[PDB]
Structure 1
Amino acid sequence: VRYSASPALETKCAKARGAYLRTHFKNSREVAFTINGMSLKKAFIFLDNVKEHKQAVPFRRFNGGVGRTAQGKEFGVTQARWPVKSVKFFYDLLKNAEANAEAKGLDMDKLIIKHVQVNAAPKQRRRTYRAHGRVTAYLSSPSHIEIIVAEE
């Protein structure tokens, strides 16, 4: 497997990825865009706060119809949400990257999220039944997620 980027010293970075993860691609993109560039420890704090509805993930691109909240203010937006299912996958991937960095002996105090990317995985297909005996798609939009953390 190849990560989409190498924006760090190979010897001073760690990697984690997840493939075919059954969580919404659009929500995951918004989470990734928000935690990218954060320090690893603060990313964990922010993700836990989103779980508690103390902070929110701003929805910037896939925002059609998203509701308004005073928790978007800190990011200068009005549309934000708390996609906890996507949060959990990122929390587990961040934990994996941390353990990978602990295995390479990096200084676990300057670790920064240097790269995070969500790609749309192959869709999984279900059916839904519509009026007048019709059948239409009921697809899932799983995601591929990769994370690179590095010393600042």
Structure 2
Amino acid sequence: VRYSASPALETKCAKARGAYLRTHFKNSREVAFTINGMSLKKAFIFLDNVKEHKQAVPFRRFNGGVGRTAQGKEFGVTQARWPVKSVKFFYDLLKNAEANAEAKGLDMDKLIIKHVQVNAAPKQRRRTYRAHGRVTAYLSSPSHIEIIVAEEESRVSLKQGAKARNLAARK
């Protein structure tokens, strides 16, 4: 399957894919938006910090009801969380992308996360039982994730021509 972005030219990049991963699509999107653009090594440091509650993933789009924290101030936001299931999946994919770059012969010092995207996977669905003999949906929202790591990043009129000549050349 082909990726979303014009990069993934295999001469100077690596990429890694994940499909039908059973973790929340909204949390995955927030993690992807946070890590998009930072270097691969520093991305790993950030992800371990999130796992250890030393840094937090800012919640920008899917922020309804998300509590405030002091660890969102380095992103200029008030709402941030520590989604460990999503971060664990992103950590596994980033390790896979780093392995792909290793086998491909790239440079680990200069690699950055050039592209990362989360898409909604088909919902698996379940049932929940309500009051008054009612049943409704207990849907699950999985995610497709794809990551790409890479390196680095007049004519002039006759009067105008005569004016230009007589001013510049003549003096």
TM-score (norm. length: structure 2): 0.86
| Aligned-pair CA distance for 1:122 | 0.1
How big is the shift at 1:108? 1.0
1:22 equivalent in structure 2: 22
User: Could you tell me how far 1:115 is from its partner in structure 2?
Assistant: 0.1
- Give the 5 Å matches for 1:2-151: 2-7=2-7, 9-150=9-150
How far off its partner does 1:9 sit? 4.6
CA deviation profile, 1:40-63 (whole Å, cap 9, x unmatched): 000000000000000000000000
**Secondary structure of 2:26's aligned partner:** helix
> 1:53-101: per-residue Cα shift (whole Å, max 9, x none)?
0000000000000000000000000000000000000000000000000
Select the structure with the greater relative contact order (CA < 8 A; seq sep ≥ 6): 1
Q: Distance in 1 between matches of 2:32 and 2:138?
A: 25
Secondary structure in 1 matching 2:129: strand
CA contact (8 A) 2:39 2:112 kept: yes
| Counterpart-to-counterpart distance in 2, 1:109 and 1:6 | 23
The TM-score normalised by the length of structure 1 is: 0.97
Secondary structure of 1:20's match? strand
Counterpart contact for 2:27–2:83, Cα < 8 Å? yes
In 1, the alpha carbon distance for the partners of 2:6 and 2:148 equals 8
Ranges in structure 1 where 5+ consecutive residues have no aligned partner: none
Shift of 1:106: 0.3
User: Is 2:8–2:15's contact at 8 Å kept on the other side of the alignment?
Assistant: no
From the two aligned structures, give the one with the greater strand fraction. 1
SS in 2 for 1:11: coil
Q: CA deviation at 1:36?
A: 0.4
Q: Give the distance between the partners of 1:22 and 1:124, measured in 2 at CA.
A: 9
Detail structure 1 runs of 4+ shifted over 2 Å in the superposition. 6-10
CA RMSD of aligned residues (A): 5.9
